[PDB]
Structure formats: C-alpha cells, structure tokens
Amino acid sequence: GRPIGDDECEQYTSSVSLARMLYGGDLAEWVPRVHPKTTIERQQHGPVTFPNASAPTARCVTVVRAPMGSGKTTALIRWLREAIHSPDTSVLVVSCRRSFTQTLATRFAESGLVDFVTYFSSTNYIMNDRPFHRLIVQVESLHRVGPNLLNNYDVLVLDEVMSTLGQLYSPTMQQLGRVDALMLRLLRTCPRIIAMDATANAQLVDFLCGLRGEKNVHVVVGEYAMPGFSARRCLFLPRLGTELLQAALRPPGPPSGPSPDASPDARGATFFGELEARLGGGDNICIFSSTVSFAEIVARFCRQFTDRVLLLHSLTPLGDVTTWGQYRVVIYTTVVTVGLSFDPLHFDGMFAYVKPMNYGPDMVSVYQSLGRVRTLRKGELLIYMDGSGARSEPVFTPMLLNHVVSSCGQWPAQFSQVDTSLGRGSRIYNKFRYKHYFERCTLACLSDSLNILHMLLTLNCIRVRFWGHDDTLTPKDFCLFLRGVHFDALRAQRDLRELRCRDPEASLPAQAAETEEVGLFVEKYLRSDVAPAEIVALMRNLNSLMGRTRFIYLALLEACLRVPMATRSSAIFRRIYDHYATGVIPTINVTGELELVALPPTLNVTPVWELLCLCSTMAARLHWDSAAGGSGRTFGPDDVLDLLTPHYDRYMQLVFELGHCNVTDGLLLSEEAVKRVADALSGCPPRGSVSETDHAVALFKIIWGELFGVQMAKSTQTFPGAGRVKNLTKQTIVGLLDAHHIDHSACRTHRQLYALLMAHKREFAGARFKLRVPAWGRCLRTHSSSANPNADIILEAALSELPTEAWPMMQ
Amino acid sequence: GRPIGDDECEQYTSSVSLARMLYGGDLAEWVPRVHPKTTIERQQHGPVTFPNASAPTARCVTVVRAPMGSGKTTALIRWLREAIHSPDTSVLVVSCRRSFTQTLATRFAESGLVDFVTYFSSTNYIMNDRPFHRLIVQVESLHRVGPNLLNNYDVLVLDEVMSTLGQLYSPTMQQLGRVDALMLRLLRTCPRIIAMDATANAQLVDFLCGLRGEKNVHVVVGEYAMPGFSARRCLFLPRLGTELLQAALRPPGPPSGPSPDASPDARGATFFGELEARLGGGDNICIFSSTVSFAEIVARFCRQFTDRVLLLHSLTPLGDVTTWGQYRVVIYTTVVTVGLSFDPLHFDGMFAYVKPMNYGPDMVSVYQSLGRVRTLRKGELLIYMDGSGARSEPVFTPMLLNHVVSSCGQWPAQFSQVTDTSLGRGSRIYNKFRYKHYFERCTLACLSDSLNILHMLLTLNCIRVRFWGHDDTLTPKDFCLFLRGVHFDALRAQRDLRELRCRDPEASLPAQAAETEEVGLFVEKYLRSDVAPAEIVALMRNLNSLMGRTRFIYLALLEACLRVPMATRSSAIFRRIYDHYATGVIPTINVTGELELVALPPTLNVTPVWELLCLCSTMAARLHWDSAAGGSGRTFGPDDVLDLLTPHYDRYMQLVFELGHCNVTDGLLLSEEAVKRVADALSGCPPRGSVSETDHAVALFKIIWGELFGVQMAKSTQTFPGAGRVKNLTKQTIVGLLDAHHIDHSACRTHRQLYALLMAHKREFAGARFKLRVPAWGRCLRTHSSSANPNADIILEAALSELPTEAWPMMQ
DNA sequence: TATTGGGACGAAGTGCGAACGCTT
DNA sequence: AAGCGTTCGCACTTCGTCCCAATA
C-alpha cells in the first residue's frame, strides 16, 4: 500500500482537534482567550473542590468539567451545605435517565428535607396541596410537574448537564417548547447555579456567559479520577480474529484439518484470542456489544468455555444488575444505559465490540454503557472497532476546523458550513443542536467515531493505548492502525454472516432491526415506536406479491389523507406515487432470510389515481385511520349505497378496467393483481339481479377487500357512529334521541337521557359494520400519527404548501 | 343520466362565493361589516370619480375597485392635479408589465414634469446625482432605481395594485426582501396613497387598515364601464365541434361517406361552427388559445377560408401589434399578455380556447390576454373551456367557504385548513397575499373553479356573460348540467385533436412538447426554470438512447452530491438521493419524433455507484465543476490528473473494473450495455507498466469522465493557468501569475505595465493544459450554483442536509 | 381429494354501577 | 358538599380467524 500522506496527517489532527472542542477538552485554553472576565481553575491533584458558596466573592454561576469518579457528588453535597442558609432556602436539582436520580436521592441522606418527584405514578405527591420546595427531578419528566414548581428557586443544580441538554433532541421528548422556556427562565433567574458534566463544553460556558455575563461565571476543570479499583486501562485491538471463532464454533464431528492460511499472526492481539485467554484462565468477563447480531455470536463462543453466560438485549427479559454476580460472563447491549450501575468487585476485565452505524448508538451512549460496570478487578478494557459500515471520508475535515476556530468556537448547525426553517425550538434547543447533529453524522466515519470515543475515554482519565504502540501514537502510526482495522473489519464480515445465529432462541426481530434497509423502511412508511416483532410480521407479508400490493395501496391511501392536494393535482399525485410506491423494500422470505425487493415504476398512474381519489373520499367519510384499526364510524348497508351512489358507475368502470388491464404497468397492475380483481368481479352479482344495497355491499366489499386487504366486519355496538355505550356524552345522546324523534327534555340531566336510550335501545338494533385493517398496516404513519420531522414529513409539507408554477413562462 | 344533487348546488354556490371573495366582488358588504370606520361609496352611474384630493377631510388612503374602461385614468389625472399642492410636491407611481406604464406616461403629458425609468435601456440615471422627484416605475425594476428614490414621497400611486403585488410571487422576481421592505416603508409613510385594480380585494383593504387604521382609509367601488368597447358580450359554448374540423381538414382526394355522428343537433353552437360562420360571412376575427397545440390547428382551419392568417406564440418571431390590421385572422397565446394592446377598430369578434392545466396560465393571465384587443366591432366574445386535464373535484369546497367566512374573510395560505413550516420566506407583504397566488394555481386542477373564476373576472369588468341556451339566468342545476355537457365533449374531442396534430412538417415540436405535464414535471425536478423548449427537445432526444439516459442520470447524481455533501458520507442519505433522482419515469423523444415515457428501474445494490460518485464528487470539487458553467472552472495538466487519482488509484481501478465485470443487471446504471462498454473502454486502457504514470492516469481519468458522464477532456487555448485569456488579464490576475517562476518585480500598478512582464514570461507558462467540458445537453441541469425559487426537490435536499438520521430501535 | 364443521381463543364490544373533578 | 358530566371496572358476550379432527 501507499505511504501515509501529509493530508492524512492533517485529517487526523483536524478530527482530534474538533473532537476535543465538541466535548470540552479545550476549555482551559478557550475560556481565557474568548471570555477574559470569566475566572477558571484546574485541579490536577486529588478530588475536585468547588468554590466556598457562602463567600461574598463566590460567583453566581459555576460550571464544572470533571471526570466520572473525580469526587463530584461529595463536592456538590459540600457546596449545598454551604449554599443553603436555612430551611426557607428553596433548591432544584435536575438530572437525566442516563444517570438516575435515585443515586443522588440516596447520598442526599446527608441533607435535611429534600425529596424527588416519582417519574412513575406522580400522583399522591409529598408536597401535597403545595408547590415543591426542595426537589430532585429528571428532565424527561419535568413537564409533568412544571405547574407545581415554584416560579423561582434559590439554588439550581444541573447534574450531567450535557446529558440533560441531550434529551431535548430525543424523539421521545415531550412538550419540548414548554421545557425549553422553563429551563431558560430558571437559568436566567436563580441566584446560584451549578452545572456539572464530564463533557461540559465551550458552548455551555458561552451560553451561561450570554445569559449572565462573564463576571458572574466561574469554571473549574477536573483532571483527576480515583485510582485503584477504578484505575481503568483501555486497549484498542487491531484484529477481530474470526479465524479463531470459526475454528471454535466448528462442529466437533469431522477432523477438518487446517488450510494453509492464517499461519502468520498478523500482529496477533485478536479480540477472540484475548477473550479465550481470559475465559480459559478462569477470569470473570463482561462484554458490551453494539449489535445483537454479534452479542449472540460471542455468547455462543463463551458457552463453549463455560456454562454460566448471561446475555442481555432489548428483546430479552430485563435482568437486574444485582443478579450479575452469579455469572462468569455477562454480555449486554445499550439497554443497560436505561438501568442502574453494577458496583461489586466481580469482573476482572471488560470487552467491547463497537460498530458505528447510521441508525446505531452514538459514541457517547456507547461510553455510558461501558461505564455501567463501575469496578474491574484487573482494570483491563479491550475495544474492537468494526469499521465496515463506516468506510466514508471524514466529517471532521480541516475545512470544518478552520471554520469553527475562525468563529471563536461557534459550530455550524449542519455539515454545509454556508438553511430553511425546518425546526422552531427556543434559545436552548438552537444553541446545542450542533452537538446532536455531529454526534449522529460522525457515525458515517470510523476515524471520527474512534476519535470521539478516545476523547471521551481521555476526559474521564482512562489511559488509552493501541496495540504495538504502547507509549504514544503519531499521526502516521494512527493512519496505519486505522487502515489495518478497516481491512480486518471488512474481511471478517463474511465469517460473521456465515456464523449468524439462526437457532430458534436467536432473535430474528432484533437482527432484522440492525439492518440499514430496515431503518430506512421504518423511517419512510412506519411509526417510530413500533416493535421489531411487528415489523418482522409485516416484512413476512411483504414477501408475497399480493401482500406487497395491498401494502402499497394502503400506504398510498394514507398519503392521500395526509396530502389532500394529491387527490386534486395529478402532478402532486405523481410526486407522492414516485416516493411511496416505487423504490426498494425489505422482505423476509419463507427461509427466514431478509431479502430486498424492487417496486417497479409505472408509466401510467391514471387508473390508480382515479381509484384512490374515490377511496380517499369514502375513507374520510368513515373516519379512517389504519393506526386506530380502520374506520372510526360504524355504517350499515344503506350507508354503503350512499357512499358509492355519487360515482357508482365510475367505481364499476374503474374496477372493471383494473380487472381487464391490457398491460402489466408496474406493481399494482401486475398479472396477479388484475387476475384477482377479475376473479372477484366474476363472483359479484349482476347490477339488476339483487337489491341496490346488496350489489353496493358486494362492490364495496370487493374494493376494500382486494385492493387494501381491509375486512368489512360486523359490529356488536348498541348505537350508530363511534360511541361505545359507557362513553356516550350528553350531546351525542341528544343527537340519537332526535335521530328517531324520541321523547326529549323530560329532565335536563345526562342520566335521564341515558335512561331513555337504555329503554329505546331496540329501536337502534340493525345491521352494523366497521372496516378493519389487517394485523400489519396498524404500524403505518397516518394523519393522526404525531412524529418528529424527517425527510418524508417535510416533503409532504412542501407538496402541501407550495403550488405548481406555470412552466413555459412569460417575463 | 342521474339528476343534479343539492350537494352539487352547494358546491356551485360555494365556488362562486369564494371566487367573488378572492377578486373583491364582496367589497361593498364586507367593508361595513368588518371595518365600520372606513367609508365606502358605490358609483353605479357614469365613469368613476375619486375624492376631492385638496379637501381637508379627504382621507390619507383611498382604494379603488373599478372596471377596465371605467374612466380610472381620467380620474387619476384629475386627482393628481388636485393632490399636487406645489411644483416641489414629490410623486411615485408604481405599475406592472401586465398594465404597461407607457399608456400612463403618454397621458401624463398634462403633468409633463413626471418621468418614467427606461427599465429596458438600463441607462445610468444616477448620473443626475439627485433623487427622482416625480417617477413612474415598473415594479420588477424598483430595486435598481432604489438609490434615486426620496426616502419618502408626498403622493404614492399604485396602478393595477393586485397585478403589482402578484409580481412578488413570480419565479423571475429579484431581490424580493428588498422590494418588500421598500414597499412596506412607502405604505407606512407616504402622506397620500391611491391604490387601484379592477380586482382590488378585502385583504388589501384589511392590510391598508392594518398599516393606517380604518379612519384613514376610504374605498371606491365602480360598477360602470364605458359602452362602445366594454359593451362586450361573452358566451360560453357547450361543444368544440371537432366533427366540422375533421370534415374540413380531410384531404380533397377520398370520398369520405356519411356517418350518424352529430346527426342529432346536440343543441348546436360549436366553436368551429360559429367560427366558420364568421369566416364565410367575411368577418375579421382574433383567436386566443391557451395552448400552441390548438393554436396551430385553428390556424390550419382558418387557412381554408382565407389566406391572411397570422399566428403568434413564443417560438414565432413576435411581430408588432400595429401590423394586425393587415389580417383577416390573428391567432395568439399568452405571449401577448406581456405585450402592448391593439386599439384600432379592426376585429369584428373574438374567440377563446381556454384549457386549465397544472403547468398552464392562470385564469387571471387568460383574462388579461383577452383584454389585448381593445374594441370589437360586433362585440362578440365566444369562449370554449376544455375541461380534459381539469376533471378533479373542487378546491373551492363548502368547508373552505365556512372557514373563510368564520375568520372574517381571512383565507388559509394553503388548502389544508390548519396553521406547517416556513419553507418559503418573505415580509408582511409577501405573507399577506400569498394565499391569492396559491389559489390561483390550485384551482387549475378543477374546471368548475376555473370557470367560476373566469366568469367572476368578466363580471367585475362589466362584460355580460351568458351560457348557450340560457338566455338571462342560470340556476345551480343548469350550471351543473352545462358543466357535465362540457366535460363530456372536451373528453370526446381529445382523440380528434391527437389525430389532427400536425405530424411535424417542421411544425414547432418544442412548444407542443412543453405543454405536456410529464415534461413540466421533468423540468421542475432536474432542469433550470429558464431553459428554452428547443433545448429541452434536444435533451429528450438524447434521453431516448439507453447510453444517453445513463449519462444524464450519472451527471444529475453528481450535481446532487455536490449540492448535498452528506450524500457522499451517509449511505442512508445517498439512498434517498438515488431513489429520488435515479428512479422513476422520464420523458423522451423517439426516432419518429413522438414523445415517449421511459422507466428508470430501481437498483437493489447502489454501493458500486455510490463508491464511484464519492470518488468523482471529490475530484469534481477540486476542479471547480459546474455543468451550467460548462464544466471545470479550473484548467489542469497531466501532472494534476495523477495528483487527483493517486490517493485512491487502486479504488478507481477496482471500481471501473468491477463496473465492467458486474455479474448482475441491477437497474439502469449497471445494465448490460453500460457494463459491456465500461469493460471495452477499460480493456482498451494501457496496462500499468506499459506507459508513464501520467499517461495511465490520463487514460483512466479520460475513461471515467468520458464513459460515465459523457464529459470530454478538451485541450485549452489559454497561454496562462487559471481561466484567463491573454487580452483580458488585469492587475490582480497578472500579480497572481507573476507569483510563479519567481518573477519578483517593482513595476507600477497600472494593468498594461504589469501585462508587459507576462507577455515576455509567457514561454514559461506554456504546456499541455485541459478543461473538462460538459456535452451540449447537461448545460440545462440545476447545479449547485443555480439560484432558483424553492420547490419540493430543493426542500427535500434541504431536509436531507439539515436533519440527522436518528438511532432507530431506540433506547427507552 | 380436499371438504367442513367444530373447538378455541383474541378483539372488540355491552352496561351496571361506580368513581371523581368541580362549580354550584 | 352534593348535584352533574364524563369516563372507567368486571364479568360477561359476539365475531371471525385457524387449524385440526372428522368425512362429503
């Protein structure tokens, strides 16, 4: 291969430098330069110590950048003991799911009269009939208690502040605009603030200087963490070593002697070699894995050397960390980020397999996960970075560094350095949006991802080394290492594809969800909150050409209810069709293997558009929502005739034409589709052979049944419309009494008018039905489905908001 | 046929009512109802009279809704004579290309101190070194004249104000934010304002009340138009009558025996029948057509009854309107909307073929066009509305009317009645009237809405409108019957017009292609808005070949990769750009000359394409590539070529090899011809040891650019590096060249003295030097430099640039 | 050969009779 | 503090998908 370029050395140096800026590693140099009136100090020896809060010279805002295990919680309790003058002093402590409040609430046994809001079952609150006074909260739950907070507090604590600010960008975030304004009001008005994170950065210090001026901010920088039981040492391994894995997992029956390959060690230090050495040597080990796919493989490998291997991921029952002392090997994925830490001196070493992926965990999540085991008896942490999946050129380019350093550390909010109003958050949301964006973008590139992870380890005082460079690494050495890793990672994929666990206990729903194709599919058609097992059930249905056709029809109908100009402009319809009804979709075949399928484009969409126009109006009239299960209204055979009769002969003509289409124009007019529609019409009673209602119900049932897979099911409802008996409001009761001209206003009260209907219920008996959407199809984004924006939602907004301009125009 | 429903009668009544509200037909009721302190008056008898401008009680703002031909220009001149208290009183008059300023500037001879900006000449009026004191302006040039404008004027006149505000929404609008701020300053600050349009509406009256309060606004409603020309009578015809056209354009050879078609009269009065009657009767006729396709057919028909037939459209040489008195028939299209009016009493009657289309002219444009001939000697206007193309259910629904009337006449800015992101940007002025532009374009989807709008505009200009067989009144059921008839005839007649299409005896294919919806939609997605239809036909002929089509898509993808740089980084984002640009359906022109749609089939594995586009996007950026600008901004030599490839040479070699030897036909870009021709080209390249590194590098570079994108490495005529030709070098570019070859100098800063140095040292700059050149087609592509008003594609790329992929199976 | 009817059990209701927020 | 409107618990029933046992 080619020798290392000077450009490769500048790429490296730029990536490291931007990583250092994003997580606050530059803070001691940047503060004096850019905010000269803000005081700063560094504490390199022993635990951190915050300023004496009772002194008149102690500033209103203090911000702390100090390691996990630097003594922060002890310095905070000391600072609160000094800050709190009286029981009349109010206090607010905000935290996050990433670092549970229960640890603070436990250690705060040291302080009088402080309590925490239960994020579960928040009723029966301790400060009953009063606003909260001395309170611990998690930001993810803050909107629940916002109206029962004091308007202002005497002390504000933000713990893991960058993790707190990170929640604003989560898809689960709720009442965002309120939580923005609430936090901003507290920041602008509390007379003492303390804000702490291992990664508190220049933009936080800038923001607090913006709200309160340099002379009221102080910064303290920790560069010490507790030795001994927490003196962790990290090693990046060069090679996965699947040649050992495949030889171990080999069936023991045949002799199967070795081929003349993998004879040289190629720098050895394999992930699997090093792991086997610990397992054979009798060590207790814990293994983080980014992917379930690999977690299952390494569990199989561990189950050869031991019996007692625990495996934890989202689709396993949640094992509490107290149980982990029972096992020789514990394998987990990022799910333990939601749970508590494991404290006991049980494990000798830790292994980690990290694979950046566009829809994967971010490196800051990975770091959180690696921390969940607090204590390691031998102090080893071995990391393998799988760069297949992440083979792109860097995002932390020299151009971006030159930009950011020119603007005094002010980052661009998106990768084009020199925008449209696609979001509308407040000061807080806009200030830190850059950090969320680069945490997700850099996953595209292994070099950037590695540099971020290395930065996070270094800022927490973990000594990081790379194999064969066990002192310090020059840019050329890094580029050689990283070049080697990309090659190893790329060749190992075939071994991991061969070894992919397909025994019944191996989770196909989890393994499917780690595929990029599935993430894209989910992002375009489906709701974000659907379970992987629901998706596999849909993808199995999509494998059949009939199931796939019905899926696309149903997704088009939903688009037409979301974009009502699609029902009117053929031009807009062609944009919606090209987007939702052409391209590639993931399916699962009968073997259980994931398999992509093309949706061929259609030259003439006119028959489809006419049909969906008709069906969209009748869908709207029946209050259709696939997510809600189908039709909101009940309807009877008379309503069916009323729905069809305005355009009856068009429905007849279009279903006939679809049954006899001369050309196989794309997906929806393929041979099986037109055959099925013809077969359906061959069974339909002729237009004069039965009552108008009988023919109308037959036709309606064929349209909904064949095209969308939607069943006209009989209803047990006592009364028409949407209303269940027990939920019937007074206004709807009056409507029902008037609809039959029943006696009215005997009394004004609900219970009287209810008692009338419950006597006259027999007058409301009859044939009654609902449209039911199939089992799949309930997981689709619909007009009712609230969702944070993406490319598809914004495209539909554009198609709704912007009109078609006249083309060949005159000046 | 089934009877007309009461729901159709509500649809009709809603459509009419919303049309009335949009063009200010409701103004006499709505002002008393919503702004009681704003005085209003009705002038039903004789020409309009504005308030006495010299009175102490006469209000600061007056706004006038009055017909074309109602006397407005005389009332304006009278009002100005009264409003101008002194020789030093300043005046600004703003108008539009639709309402051309020279008619005012001519009649303003009576106030001969007033002058107009010669926006066409673009002369350096700033040489006067003083503000313009009494000025007439075309709104689209207002920014350029911005400097010579008194910060405030004593009198502000807005002429065809609605037509003026309409320019803000034009694609060709320039420096919008500046023109917005300028007009909004003037409206807030000028001591007297008068604003006039035949369609001045409630939202303008509301906006002026918003800036100046009800007590400072007064409204005049005119309902009279001068007889002799605006005594025009309009009749909507139920049938096109293509049976007569077919019988006429039939060759003289065959016997053509009779058939039962139109043996029953179908109540008569066809477009072509009525036209034939006037042509045979010796009348002089003018014909508006919405489409060139139809204009050429009616020109062929007229050339049977007469010799002297003129025809005018965007691809004809645009002859001056004064010449029209020479002809028995003049056929024209929207080209005359921007042109001048014809005043002499030549034409007897006027015919109009109007066809709503999503990419066509709006009905207000059509109306302006009909207004181009001032006077018709027999007063007749006959209109045929072709609803094929416009068969959708209405946009002016009862629910929209209920919304608008509930909000006191405040329209929603889009068809969904809900408050959505600020995808487009503008001031108060732009946002206030955006709704009018939106509904002007959307209603083209529906013939009923389009007809009601055109009928409204005719009525607000005092033209008496009738429908055939309905002599004085038309109930909602009668209207719905008429529409049902029209929609049938219009759909029936399309086959006749397709048969009778000219078959290209050099007959103007580019205009007939440009009226296709598929082509409009293609141009919106891939091309610049301003390209000529003749360049589009040249591209669509190339697109017919699978090789030409492959190169086009590769080049469009490259430009997208330069626009959306995360596409070069995230395979998820690349898949969204690929799915959008490189899959779907595109229009082509086959060897016969007929238009033909072609599929771009989707690709299961785009990784080979993405790898190669990543390698080309970097290289292109380094070469300052821009297809519009013709190719590479930089010149480069064979030494640069080796430096471009060498970081990834093994990848370029492997990818072009694999692209040659791909085992699977995975969509368009990996089709059999594509892989075969890349293998042929690659196997024709010299082996790595056979030639110098630079020779191999240039061979590989030439193959990649040449086969995949169709771009030629062309030898440059330049004496010097960069982009300068000899006689066009100047001080800065000269100094930048004198940095080379260590030509240290102390010569003076004047261009020719420094040029004299390079004209000696030129021998040191000579060598093998090249540019990449885009083919003839492909210069019409929307590139990263191509400024354009937003559309769905521009906004999709914004979203892919701004929004990051979020972790999917997400932590709880 | 493949019909066919029955068991079997999730989804989606009933509806008495009650809780419960609140403003009278 | 109880008169009122909304809304839910629990023990039931109806409908229809599914496949297995019984044979048209």
Author numbering:
A (entry chain A): 16 to 433, 451 to 843
B (entry chain B): 16 to 434, 451 to 843
The article reads:
The first structure, representing complex I, shows OBP bound to modified OriS, where the removal of six base pairs from the AT-rich region stabilizes cooperative binding of OBP to OriS but prevents unwinding initiation. Our high-resolution OBP + OriS-6AT structure captures detailed interactions between the conserved R756VKNL motif and its target Box 1 sequence (GTTCGCAC) in the DNA major groove. We observe two distinct types of protein-DNA contacts: sequence-specific base recognition and phosphate backbone interactions. The backbone contacts involve a network of main chain amides: H782 bonds with the D/G23 phosphate, K762 engages the D/T24 phosphate, and both T750 and V757 contact the C/T52 phosphate. Within the RVKNL motif, K758 plays a critical role in sequence specificity through multiple contacts. This key residue makes both backbone and base-specific interactions: its main chain carbonyl recognizes the D/C26 cytosine's amine group, while its side chain reaches deep into the major groove to form hydrogen bonds with both C/G53 guanine's carbonyl and D/G27 guanine's N7. Specifically, substituting D/G27 with thymine in Box 3 would create a steric clash with K758, offering the first structural explanation for how OBP differentially recognizes Box 1 versus Box 3. Additional sequence-specific contacts are mediated by R783, which forms an intricate network of interactions with D/G23 (both carbonyl and N7 positions) and D/T24’s carbonyl group. This precise arrangement explains another aspect of binding site selectivity: substituting D/T24 with cytosine in Box 2 would disrupt these R783-mediated interactions, providing a structural basis for the differential binding affinity between Boxes 1 and 2. We identify multiple basic residues (K793, K802, R810, K746) as well as Q743, Y786, and potentially K780, engaging the DNA phosphate backbone through an elaborate hydrogen bonding network.
